Amino acid sequence: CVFM
Amino acid sequence: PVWSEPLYSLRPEHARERLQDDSVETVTSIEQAKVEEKIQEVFSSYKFNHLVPRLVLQREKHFHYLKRGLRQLTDAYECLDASRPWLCYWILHSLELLDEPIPQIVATDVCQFLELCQSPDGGFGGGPGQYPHLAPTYAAVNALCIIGTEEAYNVINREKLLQYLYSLKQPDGSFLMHVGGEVDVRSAYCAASVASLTNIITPDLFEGTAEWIARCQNWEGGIGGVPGMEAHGGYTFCGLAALVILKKERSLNLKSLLQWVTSRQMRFEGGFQGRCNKLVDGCYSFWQAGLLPLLHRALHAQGDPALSMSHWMFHQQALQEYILMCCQCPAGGLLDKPGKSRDFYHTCYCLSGLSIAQHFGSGAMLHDVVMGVPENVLQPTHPVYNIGPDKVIQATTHFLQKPVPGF
Amino acid sequence: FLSLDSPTYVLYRDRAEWADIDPVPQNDGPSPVVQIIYSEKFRDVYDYFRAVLQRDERSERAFKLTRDAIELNAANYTVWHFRRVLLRSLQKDLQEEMNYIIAIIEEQPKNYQVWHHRRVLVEWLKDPSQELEFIADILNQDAKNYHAWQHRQWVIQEFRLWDNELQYVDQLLKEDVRNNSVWNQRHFVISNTTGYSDRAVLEREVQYTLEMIKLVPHNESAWNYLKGILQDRGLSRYPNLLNQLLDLQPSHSSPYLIAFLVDIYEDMLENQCDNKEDILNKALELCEILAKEKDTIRKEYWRYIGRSLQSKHSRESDIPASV
Numbered sequence: 001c002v003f004m
Numbered sequence: 005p006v007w008s009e010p011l012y013s014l015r016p017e018h019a020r021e022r023l024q025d026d027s028v029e030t031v032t033s034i035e036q037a038k039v040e041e042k043i044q045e046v047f048s049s050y051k052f053n054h055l056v057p058r059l060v061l062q063r064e065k066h067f068h069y070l071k072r073g074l075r076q077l078t079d080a081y082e083c084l085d086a087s088r089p090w091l092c093y094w095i096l097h098s099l100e101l102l103d104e105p106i107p108q109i110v111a112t113d114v115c116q117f118l119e120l121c122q123s124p125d126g127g128f129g130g131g132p133g134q135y136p137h138l139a140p141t142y143a144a145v146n147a148l149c150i151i152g153t154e155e156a157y158n159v160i161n162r163e164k165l166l167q168y169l170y171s172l173k174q175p176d177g178s179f180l181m182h183v184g185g186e187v188d189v190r191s192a193y194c195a196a197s198v199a200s201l202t203n204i205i206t207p208d209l210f211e212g213t214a215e216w217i218a219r220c221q222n223w224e225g226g227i228g229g230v231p232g233m234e235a236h237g238g239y240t241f242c243g244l245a246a247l248v249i250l251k252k253e254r255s256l257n258l259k260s261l262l263q264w265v266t267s268r269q270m271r272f273e274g275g276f277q278g279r280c281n282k283l284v285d286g287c288y289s290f291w292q293a294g295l296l297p298l299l300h301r302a303l304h305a306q307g308d309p310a311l312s313m314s315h316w317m318f319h320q321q322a323l324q325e326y327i328l329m330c331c332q333c334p335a336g337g338l339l340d341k342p343g344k345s346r347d348f349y350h351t352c353y354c355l356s357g358l359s360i361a362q363h364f365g366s367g368a369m370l371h372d373v374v375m376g377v378p379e380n381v382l383q384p385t386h387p388v389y390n391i392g393p394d395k396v397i398q399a400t401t402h403f404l405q406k407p408v409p410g411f
Numbered sequence: 412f413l414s415l416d417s418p419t420y421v422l423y424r425d426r427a428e429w430a431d432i433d434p435v436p437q438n439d440g441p442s443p444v445v446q447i448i449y450s451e452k453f454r455d456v457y458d459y460f461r462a463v464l465q466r467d468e469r470s471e472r473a474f475k476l477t478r479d480a481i482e483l484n485a486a487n488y489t490v491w492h493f494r495r496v497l498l499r500s501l502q503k504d505l506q507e508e509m510n511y512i513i514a515i516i517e518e519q520p521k522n523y524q525v526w527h528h529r530r531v532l533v534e535w536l537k538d539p540s541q542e543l544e545f546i547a548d549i550l551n552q553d554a555k556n557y558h559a560w561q562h563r564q565w566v567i568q569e570f571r572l573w574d575n576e577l578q579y580v581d582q583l584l585k586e587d588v589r590n591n592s593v594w595n596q597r598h599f600v601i602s603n604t605t606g607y608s609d610r611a612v613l614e615r616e617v618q619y620t621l622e623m624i625k626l627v628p629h630n631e632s633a634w635n636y637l638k639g640i641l642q643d644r645g646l647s648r649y650p651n652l653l654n655q656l657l658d659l660q661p662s663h664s665s666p667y668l669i670a671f672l673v674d675i676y677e678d679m680l681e682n683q684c685d686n687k688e689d690i691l692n693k694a695l696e697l698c699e700i701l702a703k704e705k706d707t708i709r710k711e712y713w714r715y716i717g718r719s720l721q722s723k724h725s726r727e728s729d730i731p732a733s734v
């Protein structure tokens with residue numbers, strides 16, 4: 001996952 | 005009965021939930037099988053050791069990890085040097101979920117730190133001197149609201165914040181993440197979250213936004229980052245949550261969305277995957293499972309008569325089992341899956357997801373499911389903002405005292 | 412010039428050509444929270460970056476410094492922004508910059524800034540000629556890289572490079588028929604070219620999907636695609652579908668086949684089908700089998716579907732209370  | 009196993013993942017029949025690769029091996033099946041084998045070992049560990057399983061949320065351990073991290077981090081966190089308000093938010097929220105008080109010394113220090121991150125032109129950056137960006141702006145606002153003091157609320161320059169949001173708004177309804185930055189559904193949610201909490205929503209701020217978000221829903225039922233892209237839990241949470249804030253959930257085909265998210269829970273592992281045919285991951289305990297409380301409220305607002313009055317539309321028990329048995333680091337902190345290293349992001353989201361799974365609320369109706377020892381119960385979290393419902397109420401009420409910038 | 416990992420790499424504070432500049436230490440305040448104990452190399456580069464940024468020094472040395480700041484934290488969007496300012500001010504060769512971004516993305520493909528930077532470059536140059544091949548190389552290392560697929564859709568759509576994409580999709584589906592990103596790309600290509608209204612296309616698609624389903628009955632992607640392309644017009648609108656699915660029941664069952672049957676019944680009942688009664692029962696029976704045996708992880712969903720169908724399709728559903 002990643003977010004920014 | 006005596007032969008009955010109370011833990012769902014440990015029942016004999018649970019073994020039937022293992023992957024059936026149809027004797028056609030592909031990268032996807034191979035990867036999925038590896039995870040399941042690793043997780044089966046975790047499930048079987050009690051049996052092979054001849055011990056009675058006891059699911060304990062390691063509170064003291066998680067607390068130590070959090071309290072220290074709130075002050076200092078190793079260079080392992082250099083990759084998050086442009087995301088410090090997120091570190092503040094992830095940690096403070098984790099502490100809030102664990103019902104650990106935030107010392108006034110800490111609270112004031114966070115406030116001052118976030119001020120340093122606030123841009124002269126609105127919004128917050130990833131650290132002092134960095135340009136503002138919607139992701140750390142969302143995190144900073146949430147962190148300040150968790151603190152919830154007058155000081156915390158006063159940090160936010162509301163006029164400049166609104167100016168900032170307008171400078172990012174696009175004609176098609178979307179928002180850039182930052183000046184000269186990328187566009188995807190995260191921006192819509194970040195803007196809506198901060199604008200609603202601070203009461204700075206003008207009549208045209210979100211014009212076309214609900215429509216832009218609706219265009220992101222694809223053939224799968226979920227929502228992708230931008231129109232045309234694969235449905236993903238992170239983006240779906242962002243899309244639905246933003247639509248809930250804008251009171252336009254109806255723009256979506258809630259039915260295909262519900263079918264999609266429920267299908268994201270892994271039959272064997274019990275946790276959620278981010279997209280179809282990928283792997284389980286503890287942070288989706290929030291991004292994916294958090295959609296159920298949102299859908300429940302949306303469908304109930306439409307008068308849906310078939311809605312349960314005691315559970316969310318996902319296996320609450322199995323998610324808690326996955327988190328408690330597979331996502332806890334012995335030294336403190338939570339994780340993606342066994343074999344992964346702990347981090348504050350997964351600590352925040354595994355806990356958030358655990359809270360969601362433990363608490364069902366629908367107006368006057370309230371029902372809990374707390375797997376393992378009773379001390380495992382966490383404080384509830386708001387499904388839209390992912391901060392305490394009390395913090396949401398307190399903040400909104402406070403900001404409603406101020407007039408929307410411009411008057 | 413001097414790589415960040417070069418054995419002879421020297422801190423900026425020890426570089427003569429940087430002696431005129433006073434580095435600017437990070438302003439964390441009197442009592443820091445979430446303070447990162449940066450390594451020497453990191454803090455040194457960033458103290459110098461803070462200096463050039465603060466004085467807005469648009470120079471070649473500032474340009475080279477951003478490369479190091481980026482290698483230290485490729486997620487630092489402020490550095491990427493300044494770098495783009497420098498590319499324009501210094502009139503830097505953009506193909507050389509494309510070579511640079513290609514290498515950076517190859518090493519850190521799950522990063523938002525690198526893909527956005529490449530996009531800006533392509534836009535500036537109005538040249539998509541290296542895109543499909545570049546992306547294909549990344550997808551060859553991670554066939555599901557989200558940013559890669561998103562960039563690919565943008566390039567294809569913006570520059571109308573649709574001609575060979577379905578062939579590419581077929582290739583990847585052959586490598587891994589379970590790759591959901593490829594099924595999504597398949598839908599993307601078809602809906603933006605021929606569309607699915609064309610009966611010959613729809614027919615072809617369903618034949619293909621049903622064939623994939625036979626080969627790997629438990630691959631959820633083929634199932635979602637099949638439902639994805641037919642659910643819009645309404646599943647009941649296709650009478651042969653149901654029969655054909657029941658035919659797989661014996662030697663190709665899965666919670667998917669059963670779930671689909673429920674979707675067909677659900678729509679049939681929605682479009683006032685014959686034997687409303689018989690259909691509803693068949694459906695509630697499958698919902699029970701699913702919630703109780705074949706798909707218990709989704710028991711709350713299946714129970715809800717069962718209650719929903721019952722709630723509006725039971726023979727009593729239209730009968731007034733007094734009767």
Ligand SMILES: CC(C)=CCC/C(C)=C/CC/C(C)=C/COP(=O)(O)OP(=O)(O)O
Pocket residue numbers: 001002003004139142190193194236237238239242277278279282283285291521555556557558
């Ligand atoms: C407010 C805010 C910033 C929300 C962010 C939500 C979120 C988690 C988005 C994920 C985006 C993404 C590209 C995931 C794919 O990474 P991956 O391929 O490594 O993960 P995967 O295999 O689980 O899809």
Ligand SMILES: [Zn+2]
Pocket residue numbers: 001285286287288340350
């Ligand atoms: Zn994760």
